[PDB]
Amino acid sequence: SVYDAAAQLTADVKKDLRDSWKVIGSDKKGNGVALMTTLFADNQETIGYFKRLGDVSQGMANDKLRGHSIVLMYALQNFIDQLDNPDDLVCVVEKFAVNHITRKISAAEFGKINGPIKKVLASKNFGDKYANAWAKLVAVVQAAL
Amino acid sequence: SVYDAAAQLTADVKKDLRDSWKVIGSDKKGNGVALMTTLFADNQETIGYFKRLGDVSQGMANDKLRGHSIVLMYALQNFIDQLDNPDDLVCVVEKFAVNHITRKISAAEFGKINGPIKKVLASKNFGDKYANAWAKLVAVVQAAL
Numbered sequence: 229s230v231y232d233a234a235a236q237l238t239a240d241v242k243k244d245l246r247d248s249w250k251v252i253g254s255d256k257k258g259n260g261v262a263l264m265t266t267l268f269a270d271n272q273e274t275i276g277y278f279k280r281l282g283d284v285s286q287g288m289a290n291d292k293l294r295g296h297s298i299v300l301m302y303a304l305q306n307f308i309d310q311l312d313n314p315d316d317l318v319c320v321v322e323k324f325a326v327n328h329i330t331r332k333i334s335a336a337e338f339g340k341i342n343g344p345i346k347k348v349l350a351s352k353n354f355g356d357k358y359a360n361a362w363a364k365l366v367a368v369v370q371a372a373l
Numbered sequence: 374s375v376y377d378a379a380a381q382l383t384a385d386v387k388k389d390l391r392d393s394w395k396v397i398g399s400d401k402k403g404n405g406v407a408l409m410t411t412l413f414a415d416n417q418e419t420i421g422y423f424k425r426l427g428d429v430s431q432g433m434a435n436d437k438l439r440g441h442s443i444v445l446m447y448a449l450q451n452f453i454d455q456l457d458n459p460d461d462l463v464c465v466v467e468k469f470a471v472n473h474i475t476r477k478i479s480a481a482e483f484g485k486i487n488g489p490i491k492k493v494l495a496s497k498n499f500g501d502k503y504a505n506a507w508a509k510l511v512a513v514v515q516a517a518l
């Protein structure tokens with residue numbers, strides 16, 4: 229269940245998530261847009277899903293992409309803040325899962341974000357240990373999709 | 374226009390917003406659910422818009438309402454963090470405006486949250502000065518609806 233996946237994030241996984249988030253979550257505009265542009269660059273097939281944001285090649289200058297990228301980073305902030313209470317983490321994961329289920333985003337397609345996350349972490353010198361920790365948090369949302 | 378409403382957030386208004394947020398933002402789950410149940414109790418005609426959350430009378434016990442309420446408080450957190458830069462505050466305001474425009478929520482109906490906000494601030498011993506500061510930030514979202 230989502231709860232099982234949540235309940236299995238360990239003390240050192242939560243430590244790696246919090247420690248990397250202190251750095252990548254400090255600049256939400258910069259790192260949020262960096263995440264979205266790496267998604268569109270490496271996975272060009274997803275661009276069509278983001279038609280509401282207009283022309284995503286514009287990057288930072290596209291006001292709708294910048295607004296979306298900041299709000300996504302607050303969704304991750306929320307996740308990081310609920311780590312010690314699985315019941316609260318589960319009801320916010322399920323709320324964001326419904327936002328993607330209505331856009332017909334499958335668990336497999338949602339997991340395409342792991343590549344971008346790994347790349348943004350690597351730019352701040354957080355290696356594979358941290359990327360693996362973040363893949364465990366993404367898998368909690370995948371359990372809901 | 375959003376940009377003029379944004380220009381109304383002067384140095385003193387920004388200070389009052391930050392100073393009261395430091396208190397109500399410390400308990401996102403508690404105050405978030407409090408805001409929503411006060412909206413439904415005082416403005417019963419709005420409950421129909423929230424049919425996805427099921428029985429909102431249950432409050433904190435209703436997992437969908439709790440998930441919704443925590444996320445709403447991170448939208449407010451987001452607005453407070455963008456007060457330094459009006460261009461970033463306006464693109465996140467417009468993102469949340471579209472979430473309500475699709476739900477057929479008018480500027481007048483969105484304004485019904487001011488009663489709830491004043492009551493929650495009042496229980497924390499933040500009076501009308503602070504309620505009026507928050508009404509000015511709510512007016513930026515109203516301007517985009």
Ligand code: HEM
Pocket residue numbers: 274277278279280281296299300303304324327328331333337338339340341472
């Ligand atoms: C770390 C992972 C992710 C998080 C936390 C996340 C978060 C968000 C948030 C908060 C929204 C706004 C929801 C709304 O207001 O309706 C959103 C929208 C969306 N997301 Fe994600 N998302 C993630 C990954 C993905 C991935 C990998 C895809 C697709 C392959 C995806 C596709 C979408 C789509 C299509 C929208 C709607 C865009 C629009 O029209 O505004 N998301 N996402």
Ligand code: HEM
Pocket residue numbers: 327419422423424425426441444445448449469472473476478482483484485486511
């Ligand atoms: C401080 C003011 C408010 C803020 C920051 C706010 C924020 C939000 C956020 C972040 C969402 C989630 C969007 C999504 O994922 O689709 C939401 C949903 C919603 N809001 Fe608000 N909101 C506010 C006031 C109101 C008011 C006063 C009304 C109506 C009288 C309203 C009606 C709705 C509705 C109908 C939904 C959809 C609930 C659902 O089915 O999931 N909001 N709001």
